[PDB]
Design a binder for this molecule. Sequence first.
Ligand SMILES: [Mg+2]
Ligand SMILES: [Zn+2]
Lengths: 158, 359, 80, 379, 76, 49, 50, 50, 49, 338
Amino acid sequence: DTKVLLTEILLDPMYDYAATVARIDGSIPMHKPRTPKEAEYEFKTVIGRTPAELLSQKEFYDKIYTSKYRPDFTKTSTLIYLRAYELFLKYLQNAPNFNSELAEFKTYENAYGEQKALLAQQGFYNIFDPNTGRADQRTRLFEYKRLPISTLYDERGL
Amino acid sequence: MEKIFQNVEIKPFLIDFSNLFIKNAAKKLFQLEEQLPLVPVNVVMDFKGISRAAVHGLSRVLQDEIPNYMLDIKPGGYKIEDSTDLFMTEQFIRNRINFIPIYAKNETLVFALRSLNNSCEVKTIYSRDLIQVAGPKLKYPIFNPTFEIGFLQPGKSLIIEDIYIKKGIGRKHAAFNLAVKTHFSHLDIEQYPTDKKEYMALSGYKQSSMTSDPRHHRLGLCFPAVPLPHINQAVRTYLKNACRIIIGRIQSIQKIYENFEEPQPELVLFSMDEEKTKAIITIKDETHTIGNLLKTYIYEMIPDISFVGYQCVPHKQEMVLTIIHKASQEDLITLLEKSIQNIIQTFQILEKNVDELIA
Amino acid sequence: MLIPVVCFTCGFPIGTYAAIFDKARTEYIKTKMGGTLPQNIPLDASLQIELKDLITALGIPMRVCCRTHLITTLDYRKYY
Amino acid sequence: RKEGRIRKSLLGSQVWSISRSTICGNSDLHLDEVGYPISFARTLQVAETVQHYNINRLMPYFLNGKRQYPGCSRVYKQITQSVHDIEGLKQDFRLEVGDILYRDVVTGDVAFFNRQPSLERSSIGVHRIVVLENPKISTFQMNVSACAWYNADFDGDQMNLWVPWSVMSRVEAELLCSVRNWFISTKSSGPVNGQVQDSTVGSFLLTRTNTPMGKNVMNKLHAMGLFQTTQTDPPCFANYSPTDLLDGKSVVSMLLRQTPINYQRAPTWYSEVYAPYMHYNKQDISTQIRNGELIEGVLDKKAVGAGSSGGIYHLISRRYGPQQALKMIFATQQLALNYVRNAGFTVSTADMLLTPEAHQEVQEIINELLLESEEINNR
Amino acid sequence: TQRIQPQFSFGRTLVYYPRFALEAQAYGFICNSYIAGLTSPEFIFGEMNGRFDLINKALSTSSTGYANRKAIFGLQ
Amino acid sequence: VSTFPIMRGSNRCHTHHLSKTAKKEIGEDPNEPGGYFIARGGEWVVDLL
Amino acid sequence: NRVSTQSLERKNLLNTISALRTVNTHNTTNASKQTERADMMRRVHASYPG
Amino acid sequence: ITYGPIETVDNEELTEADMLSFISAAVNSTGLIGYNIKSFDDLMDNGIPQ
Amino acid sequence: QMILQQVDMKLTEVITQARQYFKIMEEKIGRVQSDAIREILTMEGKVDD
Amino acid sequence: YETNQGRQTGGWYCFSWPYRVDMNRFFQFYNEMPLVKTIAHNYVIPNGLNTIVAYMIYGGYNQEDSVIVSQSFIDRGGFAGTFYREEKVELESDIESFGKPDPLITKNLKPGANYEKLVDGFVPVGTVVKKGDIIIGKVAKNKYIDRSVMYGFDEPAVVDAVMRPHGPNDEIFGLMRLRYERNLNIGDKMSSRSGNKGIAALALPTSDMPFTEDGLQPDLIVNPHSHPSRMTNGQMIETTVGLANALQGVVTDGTAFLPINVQLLSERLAQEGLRFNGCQKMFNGQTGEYFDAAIFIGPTYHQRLQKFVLDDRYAVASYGPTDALTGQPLDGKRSHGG
Ligand SMILES: [Mg+2]
Ligand SMILES: [Zn+2]
């Protein structure tokens, strides 16, 4: 009963998210567990209930780990990360509002993505025509230039 | 003699802090307002009265045939139990650490990397985070502290405990490469104006390489990390060590020559038809440096040679030098020993000139 | 995932100035981009961003390989 | 159907003792040689039956065993009529007569080289094995002039290689299926192999009368360096001073004097469509070889190219055998490559760029073409 | 052996050329060199030619296989 | 009655209601758009027919 | 089956994007167009551009 | 809508590199993949229920 | 042919003698020291004289 | 050809790669934006590197689509990455379980197998596994018959991740992930963005590589003969433009059908101190002798195609699995015989 629970929850990405949040907050050791005792302690802190306690009742998402930082949201990277984890938890728990909070945070994350995309620019540069200070449009392409008929025939029509 | 290694120019590569962007970035990244403890140094050397083979062999040795030091991770140094980061793999960090240029005098130094990201931001790991755990305390750093080893995701850690100093040569692993090529030119061969359309497809020299024998050369080599105060000493040590390496490698094949009468697997002698004697010298793990030097000096010592040549085939990993001469085995051996002595004399003169030119 | 510690072609330690170069390039680019959005910078036909003077001030030599690997290498943390 | 019993199991078959790998070029291998990675040489084995004449030769293989190359993996003892592991035979000291030793593949062994689709009689050929002792090489290396047998190129092609282990198969491989038998095409009755790409251009550059630098000559040191990798006995340069100048025709004659042939044909270099422009050297447009001596003309695709009927290699095969032809192909390829090692050869963007005047001329020509088209339209 | 057929519409070779166009460019005449660069209709015609080359190369293997197997079994 | 396969990134996907950071932390590619099906472990893209 | 699908081969991101933008010809067992139509359907058609 | 006169449009300074902006706008409108997720959402919302 | 043959058999006998010595040096005197004999006997080539 | 090759190019195949257990996936560590980029790189991350390429003849080792590669460029991480293999094994029924078999557990223990390095039936993460090693020990039902799976691959691997998830049938299974250090090897396929495939035929040390008078040396040496018949002039133009881009510190757009003038770009090369062509005086690295002709050398974006010779090569001995029907060997490397 506990083995299936452990293999189902330890491979849940929600468990890894809550575990890394706890590691950031310092509630669990920064390293992966090396003994069964500290693995059980990590499960207790991350899930919020012991594996035996979970098998008794039905609620799962209510006791998942919450940040101790209390990051007043209303420098930027930490706020974005903590708000993202809080919204992930609220989505799992089916919070009352969620959707409006999700839209607001998606706008803020769009702004932060704008800043990050600014950090990712390597410079462009355009080759300019010296005569016209714009993108160079000079080419060696073919021009029709209808020719006089003397280039193909002589005065005798040959 | 007569100072074969003529004047040498030494020019370190320094950060121009007059640039506002560079100054601000350095100040707010590393609190750096002065030059780094280790800087690259550009060494331009003029050589007169010396074959192109010797100068290029010195360049090749300084590039990837001189012993050099690297930072390396011992097996099990990467702590799998403690390295929670999923992107900073052992291969990636090992590649970054292997190629950090280090100027180390003591090989017993051991460093450790204990970077723990207990924040919500991605944390960059710098070489300044490489703390020494073994060996004498470094009075001067052996590497610059501005290298980005890697980055840690929030809540992730990277633990490496056995970063030690490894010795090797560049031709085996490139992290032992010492000098990068900066300039090479012959000052005794006239050059065309290559900015014109008539000469832009040619090399520029006014003599064909198939007929020219330059004896005046300018060699430019850059060393990646030498201490800022002791630049001249580092360059002098590098040049001397290259000369010693060449001399020792030449003496290694000279020792084969002294036992031509005793059966040696490396040296084989024949007497084919017309009083000619053929000598074949096969050296395993020998490069083009020794083969080219040997061929050049044998050909100089025996201008009337029937045939001299070598092949460093990329497979079979060996150098096979073939000498054919209208002589006997004894006289051929004396001539080859004389050529070896000429090579040794030339490189000892180079060592002396290095000593008396870079103070 | 980072600017290489040394130039891939010749082994010059371009990674000594990689962080400083990245920061200074960001600051310099911010002074050349006008109203264009950051993701539209590679599409702006009026942009003329030159990093030659920045790299020279860093002390990196005028080497094709070194400047190429310094200015073209992608940083993983900027995309992840 | 193809996957059915007949076509998949009777007409073809899956086999043991066979290897496959990507093929790459190796100009230091002879045309009848193949580069075999050592890890494959310790996987495929040759069955040598221990007798009185070979016991001394086979003893080092037995002693090396599975720990050192060249060694062995299995021994088929005749007294027990069964196969014995080499690690269990530590007490045998020597080998008995009638024993069968499965030794590692060594340099000089014959191997069957095959590239699918097998469409020609030369699609399977026998090459002498050259074992590549570099552990980081996993490819089947071959000379670029050997690719014409298999219609192969080094862009991802994979070839099958199996070493004959039985005595009859080895006899046949070295007597019947060697690639020297496929030098002359069964299809076209002409030569298959020759100089390709860099070798053709190198032959032209070496045999041309003049360079942009003047007369195409080299000193004695560089003339000797042309024969460094030819794998032949070098010619004598004792009658040459260090300042003496040798033209490329002289070294080509030094190489070709071993198999004297008579050749007289205009080179591919001289084209009548090019003649109005350019200025052809009169000594470069009439290639003549008399008794192995290159008198005049350049060597290019017509004389040394692969598949060139009537070329120098075809004549060498006709007068001295296709093995001599393959050896001469390797020697001349080495000569050309060693010449290019100093002459240099490149292509640039400016090589394909017309001058503005030439661009105007081209535009005028295309305008005339379009004007004729417009006249037809007006009609 | 023939020029580009008007397959876009009745009398049209491409959307870039008018119906019943008489200019040579509308029927696959490429006036530009590779080094000069091709325009979009020129590149489309060149892509048609190259796709023809690729199709012929691809089905050459199969057709040669069929004919070769038949000939081998007839002559072996 | 049964279950129905859900396109990644669709309205019925869980990553639809997660931010880029949350998608990053749960092992999803934050910059990928999705558009594939996760069936029997593998990833499957329904092409345009 | 009128569903055109393939395994998501994650060789790179360009491979994934191109897989999501791939248009596949319809496959039918009875005919499959094994005539001169075979090389007609593989050509660049004049309606393709854009 | 009565558009302005075409004779007063200033376009001589428009470069071919400026049309990359139009292509980028088109790509942003499409998203390069958005059609498939849109069609699956349509199937889920109306297709299967109907 | 004969001189190349005579040196050939001489070499094969020498190699056989050396490696027969080496196997004996496994039971008599252990591997770790014997594997040290071969190690620095190979970097001077030998290993077979 | 480039449309085909650009999709097989190694790079950052997924940004969530450490979270996935994927088979035959290659993650290339270093990727560069092309010096001459296009509009496509605004929407997909570029895959490849701006390798310095010398278009020349060097010993005949780059003939017929071969390329000479710098060994130093390979060592420094050029096109290096990690190759990932997955090993999913399932318990057939309740009569099978995960564990380390013993001599009494044998009934069929594999000859020459290791059966060591197994902790709780699985090889721990971070352990090097060779050809004969047994990864994941499974026993059925002596009192037990061995059903453990062997490594088998010629190339050694490292256990990167191992899990014990439940399957769709609510049963536990395997899924070990194996990690391979994959540097650029001889025989690895490379390509430019113009469709010019190249097999690495030779790796040369730094001293053996040709170098310019200013010290520039190539990562790759590409045969000039690959150009004429193929007419991949875009690669030449990209090299010419990137030569000036590198010295100018710029990243020019080279999207198709943009206004292009090769003469103006070649003139732009002259304003950077270089020749009108991209050709420079180079010296032979092995002999130190200059070439009589200036050699066109410059930065060309190159892609490592995910066709690894270590995965394609195969050699089999006279023994192995045979078809029960025909008695013939099984099919291919995957079946370990054929
Ligand atoms: Mg091919
Ligand atoms: Zn560099």
